[PDB]
Ligand SMILES: CN(CCS)C(=O)c1cccc(Br)c1
Ligand SMILES: CN(CCS)C(=O)c1cccc(Br)c1
Ligand SMILES: [Cl-]
Ligand SMILES: [Cl-]
Ligand SMILES: [Mg+2]
Ligand SMILES: [Mg+2]
């Protein structure tokens with residue numbers, strides 16, 4: 001639907017959509033921009049991520065509300081209310097899965113394969129892990145283990161690159177570690193791995209802060225605080 | 236699209252959508268319920284109103300953000316950025332107008348004509364005034380005066396019924412007066428009428444509070460405070 | 471401080 | 478208090 005709009009206009013409108021808190025539009029504009037076939041700049045990658053994270057974040061929050069209602073509905077003592085709660089949870093779930101499949105499709109066609117610098121490759125592999133993780137959150141069938149493994153594999157490749165090519169304070173490296181740690185805690189039933197990863201990441205970043213400018217220090221310490229928040233919650 | 240779903244299931248799913256803050260879905264479910272052709276109960280009218288007010292409220296907020304950017308773009312000294320801001324404002328505007336036309340279409344086919352009790356008729360005529368008011372907010376062409384007059388006429392009919400058939404503390408009557416007062420202030424360039432209406436409404440409600448139960452008192456005083464908030468802002 | 475309408 | 482991921 002965006003094929004007839006200039007790439008630059010799509011990027012401009014994505015920024016306008018962000019200002020207007022129109023995240024579905026923002027995501028559609030950024031999808032159109034990706035489909036032009038050119039690589040994304042750092043700013044453009046961040047627009048893509050903001051757009052889809054906001055869209056899928058609203059879907060995930062709604063899914064959790066509906067899943068909780070459905071769970072209460074299937075407690076013994078609860079009255080039969082019919083198929084409607086399940087149906088509507090399934091509707092939201094299918095829409096969520098569709099968004100995740102769309103993002104994964106953009107990464108596979110062809111953002112990852114064209115991404116050679118560590119900053120872009122780690123960013124996209126982190127995103128791949130994230131959207132498989134969101135699929136894993138709602139998965140219950142025969143492919144659930146494979147979905148979890150797909151998330152793990154993408155995160156692991158991103159981690160391996162990030163450790164070799166980025167400093168321990170790099171915000172992309174830190175955000176990847178944060179999310180992989182959440183994967184371990186919430187998805188893979190590995191709370192000790194989650195805690196170890198968060199603590200090692202935090203400590204290695206702390207030791208590298210002395211190399212940073214004031215502005216970089218602010219960026220890195222912000223994400224370190226997210227790691228600390230999780231460590232405080234989990235221990 | 237909702238023709239194959241039971242009326243009761245649509246209402247149930249509208250309530251689930253509300254809990255999940257999925258207001259577009261909520262509105263689609265309530266549209267489907269209206270299109271079953273039966274009158275709406277008090278609760279169902281409120282679900283219809285909540286759903287569409289939230290949908291159009293997000294559109295109006297986005298339109299105002301974009302309109303402000305467009306206005307700044309056409310200040311002398313500003314750089315030419317191309318047609319994109321106007322195009323995107325127009326896109327949001329057209330979607331907003333479409334929602335308003337949908338609501339007005341439901342009211343015209345056939346909610347208003349079947350509404351005989353004051354509580355339903357005033358409610359629907361207030362809604363008609365509101366959605367014409369939202370159309371007036373974005374109107375700039377040859378029909379703008381007619382759109383404003385359509386809002387005025389619907390509000391006036393609702394006011395006439397409300398004064399004859401409802402007590403001055405009735406929450407529907409109060410919310411209608413609040414919104415008609417905003418119409419006068421913001422749309423019709425009649426701030427004195429807006430102030431007079433808000434003050435007369437507030438004072439007449441105050442004098443009737445003594446007749447009310449504690450729960451009704453809470454309902455009425457909440458809307459009276461909205462009238463007072465506007466009077467404080469406007470004087 | 472935006473004026474109030476009936477929400 | 479929901480755990481943090483990278484927003
Ligand atoms: C408190 N409150 C909202 C502010 S007015 C109401 O009771 C209400 C709601 C919908 C429609 C109408 Br009319 C009135
Ligand atoms: C602060 N912040 C978000 C919390 S991690 C980031 O810098 C960021 C943003 C997007 C992707 C990645 Br990776 C990192
Ligand atoms: Cl459904
Ligand atoms: Cl557009
Ligand atoms: Mg390349
Ligand atoms: Mg490097």
Ligand SMILES: [Mg+2]
Nearest residue numbers: 274349350351
């Ligand atoms: Mg009737």
Ligand SMILES: [Mg+2]
Nearest residue numbers: 353400401402
């Ligand atoms: Mg009466």
